[PDB]
Design a protein around this ligand. Structure first.
Ligand SMILES: [Zn+2]
Lengths: 67, 86, 193, 61, 122, 50
RNA sequence: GGGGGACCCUGAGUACCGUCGGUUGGAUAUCCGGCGGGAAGCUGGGAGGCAUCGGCUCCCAACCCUAAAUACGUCCCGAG
RNA sequence: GCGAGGCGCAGGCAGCCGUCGAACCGGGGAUUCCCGAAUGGGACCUCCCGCGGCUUAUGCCGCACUCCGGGGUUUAUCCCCGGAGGGGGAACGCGGGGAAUUGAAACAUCUUAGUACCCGCAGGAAAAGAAAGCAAAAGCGAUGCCGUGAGUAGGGGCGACCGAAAACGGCAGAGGGCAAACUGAACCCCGGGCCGACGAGGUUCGGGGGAUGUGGGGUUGUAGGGCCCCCGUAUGAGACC
C-alpha cells in the first residue's frame, strides 16, 4: 500500500484499515506457528510496515488539519 | 490499552487445542503491560463475544499468556475456526 | 549628599551612634539564621559603590561567619615533623570570600556581585552580599550589568572572580612582587600564595 | 574601523549585540548606537580620546 | 521601639498639620522630595521646614538630618509614615524625608509649625 | 527461588533466550566462519552474572 | 568646539602598622590569610628592594567588562 | 542528488521491494518502552502505589526540593502565573585541601612537591588585561604566548639542591563602563492597541519596580569632571539599526 493512495482516504477509514491490518497481522503470526505451508514469508513484514505508514500519514493529516 | 494492541498471537499448542474443545477456552499471547480488564475488553470487542473469566501468567521466556473462557452461549471452536486455528 | 554622611558615620562605628546601633543589631542578628535575605542594604554608600541598584533582579543577603582560622583534621598515616601542624593555621580564602560562597550555595540561580563588612563581635563576622539574577529582563536590559548574563560568568564567586577573590589571588599587586599572580595562580604552579 | 555589531547568545539562548572595539554587550539597538557614537567618535574625529597615555599612543600612531 | 534619630514626640494633630502643610506647599508652593534632595536643600540653606518619617530602616538614611538642621537653624518635624509622607508629597512611592522651600498658601501654617516645634523641643 | 521479583525474572528470561546455538543456515551463509557466540552457557558450570 | 574661576566630587574596618601560620628566589627587601590597631580623602594620596629625613622621577588603589595572538583533542581531512 | 538494482557484519532457503525512480547519499520531519539529575509518592530487584481538573468512555493536562520576579488568600508559605538551578563530558581551564616512598649515600631544615590524590566551579577555549606599573644620562606605554636574558640576581644543615623578572628581537594588537559632584521621574520590565512594512523606529493603556534615587551626566593626574562666566556653532560632517 502506497502513500499516494493512503492520502486519498480520510482519518476514519485510516483507523479502520489499521484495525483490520492489526487483526490480519495477529492471524498471520498465529498461522506462522500453526503451519509451515507459508507461501509468502514476507507478509508479516509488509503488514507491519503498512500499519506504520498508515499511522505516519494519519499524524501528518492531523498536523495539517490543526495548522 | 487500545483493544487492538493487546493481542500478539493465538496459541496453537496441543494444550491450547485441547482446552478449546474441552473448556470453551481460547489462549492468546498478549502484551505484558495488559491487565485482565484490558484483555477482556479486547477479546469481547474484537470477536463480538462475551467472556466469563480471564487467567493470565508470564512464561519463563518473558511473554504474557492469557486463558480466556467464553460464556456457554458462545463457542470457542467457532472463533478458532474463524481465526484458522482449526 | 547623604552618601558622604553615611560613609562618615560608618568610618569608625565606635565614634558615633553607629556603635550603639550596631550593638543592638548584633544582639538581634545572633538569633537569625547563618544566611538570611534582607530587604535594604545597611551601608547604602558601600552597596552603590560596589554596584547595587534599586530595581528588580538585585537582592541583599547577610551572612554570618565564625572568626579565627582553621584546625586541620588529625593525620592518620605517618607524618614528618614539618607536616604535623594542626591548630595554628589560617584559610587561604578571606572570610568575606567564604561568606560569599555560603550565600551562593543558599541561592543557586543567582550570581554574587560583591559584598561588604557590616559588623563583628568577638565571635562572629557579618557580611552583606549583593546577588544578581542573570535571567531577569531588567538585568538583561541594563547594559551596566547585562554582561553577567553570558555563559562564561557562571560560578564566578566559586572560581574567584569577585573582588574578594581577586584580593585572595593577589591580583591587586602589579609590577615587582606580582610575578607569580598572573595570568592565574595555577598557571604559575600555584606558587604565588 | 568597522563597528558593526556582533551577535552573541545569552544563558537562555537570547540575543545580544557585542561591540567589536570594546566587547560591551547590549540588548537594545538604540543603546548600541549611542555607545558606539559616544565612545568611539574620536576615531572619526567627533571627539577626543580619554587618558593622557592613550592620547600619547594615538599621537605617535 | 522608636528609632534613636528622633528627639521629641510629635502629637498626632501636629503630624497631620505638617502633612497638610506639605500638601498645600506642593500644590501651590515648592517642595523637595527625597532624602538626597532635602539634604542638598538644607545644606544650601533653602529649606524653610524639614519633615522626617519615623519608620526609616536603616536609620543611617536620616541620621544626619536632625544635627544638620540644628546646625543650620532650620525647623524640622517628624511624621509617622513614609507612605503618607510620600503620598502628601505627590509621588507613587514612599518618601523618607521632605523639605518645603516656598510655603505658598501655607506660610502661616509653616510659621505655626515652626513655633510649636521650637516650643516643644526645637 | 520460590518467590521471585518480576525484574529479576525478566532478566533471567532474557539470559535463557540468549542461551542457544548458532543457526545452521547462518553457518552455511557465513561459510563456516561463524560457528558460535560468546553467550553460550551451561547452568551447572557457568553461572549468570546476577 | 574652545578659554577663566573664587565653588563641588573623585571608592574605609580600606591603604597601612605589630604579631602568628603558610607560600615564595624575595634575601631586615615576595604574596595570601587569622588576631589587636587603623588614617588623609584634592589645601589630597601611593611607589622608587632595611628604616627614617630632604631632593628628584613615575603614578592615582581599595568597583566592573574586554576580541586576536595561547592550551587540549572524546572527533574529522592529510602525511609517514 | 544517483540511475537499475536492493533486502547490515553474512557466500543459504523461500519470498517480497523497485521505472508511480528503490537501495544508497546530504537536508528536514514522525515514532521514540522502562530506569537514570529523575521530578506526584515508594523501592530486598529498571517494578509498584496516589491526589486534583478536562474527558460521555475509551483517555488527556498538572502535582518534587532551592530560589527570582508577581498575584490571591486560607496568613497556612496555603494556592495560582512566568522564569531559573541540579546530571553528563577523553584532554585542556579556574579557585581551595594536600602526603610518602625517594635524594641528601644515615637524618630532623630541605628535596621529592604545591607533585600524586581529594573538594568546588566554567567554556569551546578558560584565566589575565588598560598602571596608586615599570625604569633612572634616556625613557617606554593594556594583557597573553614564543626566543633570550639564565642556571644569572637570589634562596639553601649556604649541604644536597632549588631559582626569577625587567630589558631586547618576534605573533597579535583595542580599548571601554560605573560610584560621586550635578539634574530630579524626564526611567526600566511585563501584557494588550495602533502608525510604520511583517522589520528598525514612533506612540497609547493596564500591571510590577522606582525619591533608601529609575533615567540624563560623568570616568581622570604638574590632573579629570561638574557647576557658573565669555567666546564660537549645526544651514554641515559622521557612526550605527
Ligand atoms: Zn565600544
Amino acid at each position: 500500500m502506497k502513500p499516494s493512495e493512503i492520502r486519498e482516504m480520510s482519518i476514519e477509514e485510516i483507523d479502520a484499515k489499521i484495525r483490520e491490518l492489526r487483526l490480519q497481522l495477529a492471524k498471520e503470526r498465529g498461522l506462522l506457528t500453526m503451519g509451515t505451508s507459508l507461501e509468502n514469508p514476507m507478509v508479516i513484514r509488509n503488514l507491519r510496515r503498512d500499519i506504520a505508514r498508515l499511522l505516519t500519514i494519519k499524524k501528518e493529516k492531523l498536523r495539517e488539519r490543526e495548522k | 490499552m487500545d483493544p487492538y494492541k493487546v493481542i500478539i498471537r493465538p496459541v496453537v499448542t496441543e494444550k491450547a487445542i485441547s482446552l478449546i474443545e474441552k473448556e470453551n477456552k481460547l489462549t492468546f499471547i498478549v502484551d505484558r503491560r495488559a491487565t485482565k480488564q484490558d484483555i477482556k475488553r479486547a477479546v469481547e470487542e474484537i470477536f463480538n463475544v462475551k467472556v466469563e473469566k480471564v487467567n493470565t501468567l508470564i512464561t519463563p521466556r518473558g511473554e504474557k499468556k492469557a486463558y480466556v473462557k467464553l460464556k456457554p452461549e458462545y463457542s470457542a471452536s467457532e472463533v478458532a475456526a474463524r481465526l484458522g486455528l482449526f | 549628599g547623604m552618601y558622604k554622611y553615611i560613609r562618615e558615620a560608618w568610618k569608625s562605628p565606635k565614634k558615633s551612634y553607629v556603635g550603639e546601633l550596631l550593638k543592638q543589631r548584633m544582639i538581634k542578628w545572633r538569633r537569625e539564621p547563618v544566611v538570611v535575605r534582607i530587604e535594604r542594604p545597611t551601608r547604602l554608600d558601600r552597596a552603590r559603590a560596589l554596584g547595587y541598584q534599586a530595581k528588580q533582579g538585585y537582592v541583599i543577603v547577610r551572612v554570618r561567619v565564625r572568626k579565627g582560622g582553621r584546625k586541620r583534621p588529625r593525620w592518620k598515616g605517618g607524618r614528618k615533623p614539618s607536616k604535623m601542624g594542626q591548630v595554628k593555621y589560617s584559610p587561604k580564602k578571606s572570610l568575606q570570600w567564604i561568606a560569599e560562597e555560603k550565600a551562593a550555595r543558599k541561592f543557586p540561580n543567582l550570581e554574587v556581585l560583591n559584598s561588604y563588612w557590616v559588623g563583628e563581635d568577638g565571635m562572629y563576622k557579618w557580611f552583606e552580599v549583593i546577588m544578581v539574577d542573570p535571567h531577569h529582563p531588567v538585568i538583561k536590559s541594563d547594559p551596566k550589568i547585562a554582561w553577567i548574563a553570558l555563559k562564561h560568568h557562571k560560578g564566578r564567586v566559586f572560581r574567584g572572580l569577585t573582588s574578594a577573590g581577586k584580593k585572595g589571588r593577589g591580583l591587586r599587586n602589579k609590577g615587582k612582587g606580582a610575578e607569580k599572580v598572573r595570568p592565574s595562580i595555577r598557571a604559575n604552579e600555584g606558587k604565588g600564595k | 574601523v568597522k563597528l558593526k555589531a556582533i551577535i552573541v547568545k545569552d544563558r537562555d539562548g537570547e540575543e545580544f549585540l557585542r561591540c567589536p572595539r570594546c566587547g560591551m554587550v547590549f540588548k537594545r539597538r538604540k543603546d548600541y548606537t549611542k555607545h558606539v557614537n559616544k565612545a568611539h567618535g574620536w576615531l572619526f574625529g567627533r571627539g577626543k580620546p580619554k587618558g593622557k597615555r592613550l592620547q600619547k599612543k594615538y599621537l605617535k600612531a | 521601639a522608636k528609632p534613636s534619630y528622633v528627639k521629641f514626640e510629635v502629637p498626632k494633630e501636629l503630624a497631620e498639620k505638617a502633612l497638610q502643610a506639605v500638601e498645600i506647599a506642593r500644590d501651590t508652593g515648592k517642595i523637595r522630595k527625597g532624602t538626597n534632595e532635602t539634604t542638598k536643600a538644607v545644606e544650601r540653606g533653602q529649606a524653610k521646614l524639614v519633615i522626617i518619617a519615623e519608620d526609616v530602616d536603616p536609620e543611617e538614611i536620616v541620621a544626619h538630618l536632625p544635627p544638620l538642621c540644628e546646625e543650620k537653624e532650620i525647623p524640622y518635624i517628624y511624621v509617622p509614615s513614609k507612605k503618607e509622607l510620600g503620598a502628601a508629597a505627590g509621588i507613587e512611592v514612599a518618601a523618607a524625608s521632605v523639605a518645603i522651600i516656598e510655603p505658598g498658601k501655607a506660610r502661616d501654617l509653616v510659621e505655626e509649625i515652626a513655633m510649636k516645634v521650637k516650643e516643644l523641643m526645637k | 527461588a520460590r518467590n521471585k521479583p518480576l525484574a529479576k525474572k525478566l532478566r533471567l528470561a532474557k539470559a535463557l533466550k540468549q542461551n542457544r546455538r548458532v543457526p545452521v543456515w547462518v553457518i552455511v551463509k557465513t561459510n563456516r566462519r561463524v560457528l558460535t557466540h560468546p553467550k553460550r552457557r551451561y547452568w551447572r558450570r557457568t553461572k549468570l552474572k546476577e
